Amino acid sequence: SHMSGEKTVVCKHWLRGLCKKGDQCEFLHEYDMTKMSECYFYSKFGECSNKECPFLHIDP
C-alpha cells in the first residue's frame, strides 16, 4: 500500500459542512458510500425514516 495507514470512516460533520479540522480530521473527507458510519437510529431503534439514508443499517 502507498499509505502508511488509511482512514476508515467518512466524516459525518464534513458531509454537512460542520467540520473545521480539514486535513487534520481523523475521518475521511470524501463521499464514499461504502465507508459511511452506522445509522444511530437504525441501531438504537431498529428502524430509520429516511428512505435514502446513507448510513449503515446493521442487523443482528
Binding site: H13, K44, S49
Partner: protein, 119 residues
C-alpha cells in the same frame, strides 16, 4: 427526610402533546423513549419532573427535550405496565435520547437539577 419533587417543567409543558415528523419510539426496560429523527441543528435543553430522596433522583415522572422556542423534540416516560424503575433505568434512557439528539447535530444541555440529582 421526606421525598421532595423537582419540577423543571410548567404544568403546560408537562401536559402538552407533541408531534414527531419522523417518529422514533423505543421501550427500554420500564421506560419509553421517543424522539423526532427529523430534528437537527438546534440547541436542546432537557428538563424533567421527578422525586428525589437522599440528594439522588428517585422516581422519574417525565423528562422532555425542548428547543429554545419551547418545542418538544424528545421525551422519556415511565411505562404504565411496570411497577417501577431506578435511576439506573433513567440514566440508560437519557444516554439513548442524548445520543440521538447529538447524532442529529443538536447541541444538548441538561437542567441543573438533572445534572445535580441524576449525577
Amino acid at each position: 427526610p421526606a421525598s421532595r419533587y423537582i419540577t423543571d417543567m410548567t404544568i403546560e409543558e408537562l401536559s402538552r402533546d407533541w408531534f414527531m415528523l419522523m417518529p422514533k419510539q423505543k421501550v427500554e426496560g420500564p421506560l419509553c423513549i421517543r424522539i423526532d429523527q427529523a430534528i437537527m441543528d438546534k440547541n436542546i435543553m432537557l428538563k424533567a419532573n421527578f422525586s428525589v430522596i437522599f440528594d439522588r433522583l428517585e422516581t422519574l415522572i417525565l423528562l422532555r427535550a425542548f428547543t429554545e422556542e419551547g418545542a418538544i423534540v424528545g421525551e422519556i416516560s415511565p411505562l404504565p405496565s411496570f411497577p417501577g424503575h431506578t435511576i439506573e433505568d433513567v440514566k440508560n434512557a437519557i444516554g439513548v435520547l442524548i445520543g440521538g439528539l447529538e447524532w442529529n447535530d443538536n447541541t444538548v444541555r441538561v437542567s441543573k437539577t438533572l445534572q445535580r440529582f441524576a449525577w
